[PDB]
């Protein structure tokens, strides 16, 4: 347990930013989706008839 | 000068001093965050972004 820590001491400072990355991202990203849908929701509602 | 003298340019000035004032306020406050400006970061103790 001593030796591995000597070989790579950034273990303990890594798994904490790796945790304050998921919580923050995991709620902003579900926002962008909604703004998307708005914009693309102009074009999925059109009917297109033909009269020669 | 004389091309710009009148009441209408002074009226646009007093109409858009909201624009200039908000523009300057946002710019000044942003210039605090951008350069890690601690000297105004402390004027409000609510942003404890310095670790």
């Amino acid at each position: 347990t001593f030796l591995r820590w000597a070989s790579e001491p950034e273990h303990d400072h890594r798994k904490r930013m790796g945790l304050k990355m998921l919580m923050m991202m995991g709620l902003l990203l579900p926002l962008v989706y909604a703004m998307k849908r708005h914009k693309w929701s102009v074009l999925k509602s059109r009917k297109l008839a033909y009269r020669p | 000068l004389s091309r710009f003298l009148g009441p209408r340019y002074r009226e646009l000035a007093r109409n858009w001093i909201p624009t200039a004032s908000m523009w300057g306020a946002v710019g000044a406050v942003g210039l605090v965050w951008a350069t890690d400006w601690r000297l105004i970061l402390d004027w409000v103790p609510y942003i404890n972004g310095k670790f």
């Binding site: 919580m23 923050m24 | 909201p18 609510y46 942003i47 404890n48």
Partner: protein
Amino acid sequence: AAPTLTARLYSLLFRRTSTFALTIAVGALFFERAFDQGADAIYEHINQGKLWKHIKHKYENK
């Protein structure tokens, strides 16, 4: 037809374009206030009695 929170919110602070941009500013003040604690408490509770702050009480201030 009782109005929802959205109608009164849009009457209050969203249809100005000089108000709207601000309250975006607001969340980070609130988020900054409420997020360090929310993450630190859970991380520290996950693994207790295992980091120096839980062991320093043997040797601290004599």
